[PDB]
């Protein structure tokens, strides 16, 4: 049903700004991320 009535009918910038650097630093060292997750 959802597709039919879907075809008939600020905040995210902040999330992206806060996620960008953490995501980059995490992707730099994945092993340390997995280790701190285990901890």
């Amino acid at each position: 049903v959802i597709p039919i009535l879907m075809g008939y009918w600020p905040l995210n910038r902040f999330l992206i700004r806060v996620y960008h650097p953490l995501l980059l630093k995490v992707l730099h060292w994945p092993k340390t991320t997995l280790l701190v997750a285990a901890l």
């Binding site: 995210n12 999330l15 992206i16 960008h20 995501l23 980059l24 992707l27």
Partner: protein, 50 residues
């Protein structure tokens, strides 16, 4: 993230020592995909806080 990593970066890895675009692929998969996850978490917490 799988859609992201599948679309673009399926051509550069065969050439060894190539990881610059592999990170841009994950970035693309983590920039357009943030709003859905944030919305899911928000609605999940809000439908239970009351």
């Amino acid at each position: 993230l799988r859609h992201a990593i599948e679309a673009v970066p399926s051509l550069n890895n065969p050439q060894t020592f190539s990881e610059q675009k592999l990170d841009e692929a994950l970035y693309h998969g983590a920039v357009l995909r943030v709003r859905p996850k944030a919305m899911t978490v928000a609605v999940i917490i809000a439908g239970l806080l009351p």
